[PDB]
Amino acid sequence: GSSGSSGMMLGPEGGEGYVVKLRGLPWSCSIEDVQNFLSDCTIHDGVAGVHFIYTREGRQSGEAFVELESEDDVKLALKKDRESMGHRYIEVFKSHRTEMDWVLKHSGPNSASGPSSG
Numbered sequence: 001g002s003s004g005s006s007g008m009m010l011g012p013e014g015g016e017g018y019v020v021k022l023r024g025l026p027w028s029c030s031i032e033d034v035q036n037f038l039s040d041c042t043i044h045d046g047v048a049g050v051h052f053i054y055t056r057e058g059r060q061s062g063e064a065f066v067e068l069e070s071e072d073d074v075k076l077a078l079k080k081d082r083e084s085m086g087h088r089y090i091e092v093f094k095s096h097r098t099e100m101d102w103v104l105k106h107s108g109p110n111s112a113s114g115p116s117s118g
Contacts, residue, residue, distance in 0.1 A: 018069070018070060019068065020077040020094065020095060021063060026086060027062075031047045040073075040080070042073050052065075053107050056109055067100075078092050
C-alpha cells in the first residue's frame with residue numbers, strides 16, 4: 001500500500017498538508033466557532049491552525065481554511081458538510097495546504113502583490 005505523501009522535492013513540490021475549507025461562515029465567525037465546529041477533527045496547532053479568508057477590502061468573505069493533525073481528520077471534516085453553525089449553514093471543502101497558502105496571501109485586504117521578489 002502506497003499512501004500518504006511522505007515527502008519529495010523533485011518534480012511536483014510535495015509539501016501539502018491535511019487541510020479543509022469552510023464556506024457559508026457568518027461574518028462574525030471566530031476561530032472558536034471553527035474549532036468547536038470541527039470537533040471530530042484534530043486541528044493542528046488549534047487556534048494556530050485556522051485561517052479565515054478576507055476580501056481585498058478587509059471583510060469576511062465567509063471562506064476559512066483549517067489545518068488538521070492527520071488524514072482521518074480530513075475525512076471526518078468532510079462529514080460536517082452542509083452543517084449548521086450557530087444560525088447559518090457551513091460547507092466543508094476538501095483542500096490541501098499548498099493552496100491555503102496562496103488563497104491567503106492573495107485574500108487579505110493587504111497583499112501588495114505578495115513579496116517583493118518576483
